[PDB]
Design a protein around this ligand. Sequence first.
Ligand SMILES: NC(=O)c1ccc[n+]([C@@H]2O[C@H](COP(=O)([O-])OP(=O)(O)OC[C@H]3O[C@@H](n4cnc5c(N)ncnc54)[C@H](O)[C@@H]3O)[C@@H](O)[C@H]2O)c1
Ligand SMILES: NC(=O)c1ccc[n+]([C@@H]2O[C@H](COP(=O)([O-])OP(=O)(O)OC[C@H]3O[C@@H](n4cnc5c(N)ncnc54)[C@H](O)[C@@H]3O)[C@@H](O)[C@H]2O)c1
Ligand SMILES: NC(=O)c1ccc[n+]([C@@H]2O[C@H](COP(=O)([O-])OP(=O)(O)OC[C@H]3O[C@@H](n4cnc5c(N)ncnc54)[C@H](O)[C@@H]3O)[C@@H](O)[C@H]2O)c1
Ligand SMILES: NC(=O)c1ccc[n+]([C@@H]2O[C@H](COP(=O)([O-])OP(=O)(O)OC[C@H]3O[C@@H](n4cnc5c(N)ncnc54)[C@H](O)[C@@H]3O)[C@@H](O)[C@H]2O)c1
Ligand SMILES: [K+]
Ligand SMILES: [K+]
Ligand SMILES: [K+]
Ligand SMILES: [K+]
Lengths: 409, 406, 407, 407
Amino acid sequence: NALAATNRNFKLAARLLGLDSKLEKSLLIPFREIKVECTIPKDDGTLASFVGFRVQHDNARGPMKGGIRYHPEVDPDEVNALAQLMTWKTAVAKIPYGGAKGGIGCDPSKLSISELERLTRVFTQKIHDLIGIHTDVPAPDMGTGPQTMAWILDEYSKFHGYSPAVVTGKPIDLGGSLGRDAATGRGVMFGTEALLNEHGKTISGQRFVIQGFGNVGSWAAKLISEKGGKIVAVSDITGAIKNKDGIDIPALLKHTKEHRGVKGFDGADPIDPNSILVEDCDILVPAALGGVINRENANEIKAKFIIEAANHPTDPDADEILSKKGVVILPDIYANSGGVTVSYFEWVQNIQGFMWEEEKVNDELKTYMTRSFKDLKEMCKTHSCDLRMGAFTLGVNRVAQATILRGWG
Amino acid sequence: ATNRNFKLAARLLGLDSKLEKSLLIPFREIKVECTIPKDDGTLASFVGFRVQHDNARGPMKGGIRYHPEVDPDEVNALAQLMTWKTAVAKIPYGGAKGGIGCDPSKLSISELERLTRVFTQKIHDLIGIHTDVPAPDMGTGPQTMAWILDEYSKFHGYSPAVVTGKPIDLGGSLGRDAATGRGVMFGTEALLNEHGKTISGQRFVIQGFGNVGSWAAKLISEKGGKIVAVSDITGAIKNKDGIDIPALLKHTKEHRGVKGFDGADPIDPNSILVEDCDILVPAALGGVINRENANEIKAKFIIEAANHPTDPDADEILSKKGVVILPDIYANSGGVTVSYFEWVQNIQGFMWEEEKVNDELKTYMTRSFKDLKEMCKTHSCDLRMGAFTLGVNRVAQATILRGWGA
Amino acid sequence: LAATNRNFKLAARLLGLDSKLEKSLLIPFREIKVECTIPKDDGTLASFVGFRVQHDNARGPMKGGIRYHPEVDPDEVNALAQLMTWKTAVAKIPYGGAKGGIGCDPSKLSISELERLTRVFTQKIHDLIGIHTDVPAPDMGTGPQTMAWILDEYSKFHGYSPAVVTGKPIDLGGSLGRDAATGRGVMFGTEALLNEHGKTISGQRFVIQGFGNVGSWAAKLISEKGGKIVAVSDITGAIKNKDGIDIPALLKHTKEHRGVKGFDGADPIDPNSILVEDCDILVPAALGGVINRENANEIKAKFIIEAANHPTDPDADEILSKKGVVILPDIYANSGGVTVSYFEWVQNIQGFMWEEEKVNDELKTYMTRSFKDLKEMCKTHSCDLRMGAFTLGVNRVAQATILRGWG
Amino acid sequence: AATNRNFKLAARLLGLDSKLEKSLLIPFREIKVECTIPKDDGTLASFVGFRVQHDNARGPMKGGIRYHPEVDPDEVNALAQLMTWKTAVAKIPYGGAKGGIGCDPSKLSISELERLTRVFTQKIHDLIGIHTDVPAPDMGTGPQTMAWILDEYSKFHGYSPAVVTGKPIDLGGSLGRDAATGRGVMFGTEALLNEHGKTISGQRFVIQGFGNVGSWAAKLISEKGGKIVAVSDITGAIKNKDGIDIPALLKHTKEHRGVKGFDGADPIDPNSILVEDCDILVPAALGGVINRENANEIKAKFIIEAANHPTDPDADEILSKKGVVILPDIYANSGGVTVSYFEWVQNIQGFMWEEEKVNDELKTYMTRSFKDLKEMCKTHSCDLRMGAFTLGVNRVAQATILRGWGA
Ligand SMILES: NC(=O)c1ccc[n+]([C@@H]2O[C@H](COP(=O)([O-])OP(=O)(O)OC[C@H]3O[C@@H](n4cnc5c(N)ncnc54)[C@H](O)[C@@H]3O)[C@@H](O)[C@H]2O)c1
Ligand SMILES: NC(=O)c1ccc[n+]([C@@H]2O[C@H](COP(=O)([O-])OP(=O)(O)OC[C@H]3O[C@@H](n4cnc5c(N)ncnc54)[C@H](O)[C@@H]3O)[C@@H](O)[C@H]2O)c1
Ligand SMILES: NC(=O)c1ccc[n+]([C@@H]2O[C@H](COP(=O)([O-])OP(=O)(O)OC[C@H]3O[C@@H](n4cnc5c(N)ncnc54)[C@H](O)[C@@H]3O)[C@@H](O)[C@H]2O)c1
Ligand SMILES: NC(=O)c1ccc[n+]([C@@H]2O[C@H](COP(=O)([O-])OP(=O)(O)OC[C@H]3O[C@@H](n4cnc5c(N)ncnc54)[C@H](O)[C@@H]3O)[C@@H](O)[C@H]2O)c1
Ligand SMILES: [K+]
Ligand SMILES: [K+]
Ligand SMILES: [K+]
Ligand SMILES: [K+]
């Protein structure tokens, strides 16, 4: 229902643009799909064989960009859909990349740290000729992180010389960008302010509910409350809390670092975790899992705005229900694009051999997301469509035009 | 399954199960978009692909198929089979298989050239004289290879060894037309010698009269073999005293087929495999020897010129009747061996005379039959299992030597 | 062109250049001709000769346009490549000079044949050009779409390389401000030259011949600074208004018609008399050779800004110098274009595009400095602006060449 | 001298498409590079190096490097094209090229010549290569020049002996290269004679020229029983109707300036050498020595063109009607280029051959070329010269067509 939603949205956008069927078919087929054998000796000496893979969906607008997932549940349709989605997302963000997605079918929880390094290095050896600073730039995803990127960078640099721009999400000490940690949450705050301004409103005074308090949710809550938003309820995997007068986010952040989660926070009451999405508020921010808003709770949402920080939190049934209630939904492909935008800035800084101060990273991020929202808004006016459809048509249109300009022979 | 021969071979060997799993997984699988402008200006998009199964023993080798019916399991099985066949042949290659999902009968010659060049552009960094050397297959031919060579050479400089099956004027090897049929004759003499016999005087039945069948008939009859019956798609003919192959060849060039040949009587095409003879050579399609006719085969030797003419049921039946079956993976390997010789000549920058091509082919197929026979003694198995056991073992030992990085 | 070698040899005289170094500077680094054969749309073969003269790379990668035009003259191509070497040095951008093209008639080729020809040409020269080797650009017969095709084909051989050509569409990495660049530079150089005479653009009365990319942008930006545009001409006719032509109003007219002809707010005039119109500043921005042995005595302008290439011939150079007319030479006056193409390459190399405000501020900085350096050479060698420009460029190339050495 | 007419006649005999013929005439690539060196006196000297790469449909290009002040572009292009046809006639997997430097080696010290050779190599190394373009000696260059090229090129690409031919034996030159052209002259003569039911043994030969080609041809022909009845060189002409003792003559010629004064032969008028009574005439010195004034009196039944262009078109017609069979130079002296192919092969294969193998392969190659040449003459009802050109043009055309023209 995320792979179905990507191809449904692409085809709806292609019809709004009047795309020729033969160009549409070209845009659907990935540039390249690669599967490689990754066999390593385990710590006990015996062999273990894994399949690594990389779908490189499109490079009309620049090098491909996308995460590397270490996860046993590999589905070819889902991986292809995610690589295709990144092609549209980078175009919406107006960063000079196409989309890719890769990974290894493995369970990292069953591998030692030494086996994970051996597997990462073998995988890099098997694909180093297929990726590259101006070809395809990987990033972390489920099951991988900054240490994984460090190993990819180190192994790749044996083959091509020191090449920090070959991956993003690196530790700061190896060329990671300042502002990366806050990037997605900060972009959520920027896009919310852009949307509210369009309705003559401002973050200050608005009441927020945030489901999820991880990298995205905690930064969004911190930065939104610093602009005067009142965060009246938050949840994570350990429980849900509420304070109608507003949760003290600095105190909550201090609580959550010392405990497993928001549960037990002194400055808020615990509440039914299944009630968080239907709490009275102005703005609802799903920032944990997808599929949480469906035909069953959609009629009970009280927010006027939904900011999709998580990927695919709303299904198509709830979209129609919420549209008819007058709820405005800022779509995920734009709302959480602060992360991929600052990953572009990381690559830029590495390419330029010179890192930026955090203020510059955040000022460029604001510039980029203001421009994307304006272009998204103009697409909606041009095609008389909602925000989700404006973002897909914007992204598809940019890729189609770059493809047409470059030609076919 | 199509893995049955491999899995049986891994058990005759003592193959560690984790190494066995590794040998099954292909080194690399690639799918690329191939989009071209058609003659009418509109776009056409195709998917090109290449399964690179194994390169422990050297560059990968395998055909390029232009055909609308792509089956991933079959492409993978054929690439894996090539890995074992090159090892049986003792040529320094692994296996690969590739193609484009397209229908060439619906594409103009200029569109086919454009598609071939775009496909080459999309894979040029994945193939190479010491990496992966393609060849013709269904839907492709020497002209296709010429276009691949020409486009590849724009990216890497002039590289004639990057494909085999090229036209002679572009570095193709002499003796390629006859190679598979000649190897069928070489392999038959090697098997017969082991039984204290020779081709001269033996009665052959040959099903199929194409590139393999006609060359085998011509060369076997020139060694004194009596070709008593032949068939093709147009009909079957018989002459108990021996068919005049030179006359039949002249007839087939002028009449589209063996049908109507003067000097042979016509027979039921469905009875050719059970004709009385010494040596049966299926050289047309696979699956023609099965559990329904196997008990009625009269030959003492079956030479598998075609790919998989005998199914496992017939193997069992024919073994207990005392019939010796020269397996396809060895018997028709003259083709892949001479394609190695083509690559060698290109690498050496100097072409061989046909006499040298044929002498080296005889040496290679004699030595490979010798090693296959020794494998059969070691493991007390038939020829087919000796061949798979030989090929898997060679790949396994090269893989173990190269290691995994510790 | 013996006129381009005349300015070079004079500059080599003024500097103390060793005669063997002078000979070296004349000889191009490389000259390449390649066969470009394509199937035509009707199936038959067509063969063209593509070429690239790479004149000098002492100061950095070579830079120069690609011309699709049937009338190829080897002398002219060499002269333009050499002139680009001095011009990049005058602008102080880290490039040398090159010039290339294909002898073909684009008006006789379909858009499909033109794409095929461009890709084949690229395949035939891809190993001879490159991001840090030689960076082509549009010229007569080519444009942004041509550069897109070169970029796309080149990238098959070397990976995505947006900095390999300049003049790209904005969507493929072209720079903001490229359209206005040459005209903006013409205006920048005019203000610098006037300030040296204690004057400002504001109030000066301009005649501009040509209303194309250079002329219309020059006319627009000069008028916004208070310049009085008293006469303008193009291929369709000439107009005059002693109080100044309303350029925003003229721009609306000229985009909806074939030209300035019929413009309300200006009276029509004889097209062949615009160059001798009473004014302070004359801006030839159309073709070359329009200032010659006979009209030199009747131009009323005290300043001539060479927006077009070589609008003044040596005979008029002699006449106007003795008449006290100041000529801002083409090699500096129109260098805004090549300077912003350098900025486009910089932005692609840096992986990050600039705002237009930054492009135009950098353009002002570069053209201010080159005018300052050019004026200093005129003092050192007691020469006119044209020789100050050539001595500045030749000297920069000579010093880089000497430092890099031989062996 | 450079009659390009043979090609056009061959293209019509083959019925070549007119657009394909035009493509075959246009060179793949023409390159001019600056070669500037410090001279021994410290000052700079600038030279122009060049390479015409005519065709590579059949494989890497092959051709000499000329150090000579008289560079003519039309001549260089014609020679590169001729090499394309000659390699095709010989059936060696090469196309044609020709290059050089405009310089006078007699005015350069050996240190300057080395510096110039290394600078030239640095300026073209990316344009040539073991599988791209393989240079060789020519006028003004020799084995030592090739050694310097090999050495400089190998700094950029690792040890690459196959990048040039004509190397000293110690750096990968082939055994049998010295005798190659003369031996090929002897092979082609025997092949031609067999077609007429004759053999070398007993035939009477007259040989003009006693250098690398003439002396080896004479030595090998007499060892096959040919009677060498008259020989000439730059010093004079000598005659012996019973046959000259070539081993004795060779020993005489190293101790003197020439065949003049040889004790085993009487001197003859040097202007009568071509009209001497014999069976086989072998011009092996200069071109143009057979023309309309001596043609009617040639006594030979066969003419073996060892030198380049010894018979002009006028004599071809005269001698054809007298029934004289002329073995054309493009084939007759191809032993040299064939053994240079064998040198490349040996270097590529990392393992040098014995002289016996070189000479056996040369016999195989030249026997086959003569058979293909003779068959072309039957197909197209033409003489030996046109059979050779149509054979070579046809091979290049067929390779070009097979490789195709898509992008
Ligand atoms: N981090 C980024 O830059 C980024 C960018 C794009 C999209 N996203 C999307 O954002 C979402 C969250 O990302 P993250 O990086 O913050 O993840 P994270 O792992 O840092 O945090 C996820 C949070 O959700 C909470 N959570 C998990 N399951 C829950 C449940 N059932 N109910 C309530 N809370 C639950 C966790 O406890 C945690 O607080 C995912 O859908 C992800 O795809 C993240
Ligand atoms: N040719 C090679 O180099 C090579 C290599 C490996 C394996 N093989 C195998 O050899 C077999 C034959 O290949 P080929 O190149 O000789 O083919 P081909 O197309 O040149 O000739 C095939 C012959 O089989 C006959 N035939 C076709 N269908 C028939 C039918 N239903 N009944 C009877 N006769 C029939 C045809 O009339 C023809 O005489 C194939 O199975 C192929 O996989 C060939
Ligand atoms: N455009 C640049 O960036 C640039 C840079 C360097 C040099 N130049 C030189 O500047 C000149 C003009 O370039 P452009 O880009 O403005 O050209 P353009 O194609 O934009 O048009 C120039 C204008 O001149 C007019 N014109 C043409 N012929 C005329 C004539 N005989 N009389 C009067 N008007 C005439 C045209 O109608 C048009 O209005 C050319 O010589 C060019 O090489 C331009
Ligand atoms: N050597 C080769 O490999 C080779 C290959 C192709 C073509 N050729 C052609 O062969 C011819 C000779 O080649 P070579 O290597 O033997 O040259 P060389 O310099 O070794 O010998 C030339 C000989 O001709 C004699 N000679 C010069 N001028 C003469 C004249 N006017 N009358 C009579 N004799 C005269 C000289 O004294 C000398 O004996 C030239 O046309 C050359 O282009 C040579
Ligand atoms: K695509
Ligand atoms: K494997
Ligand atoms: K120079
Ligand atoms: K050509």
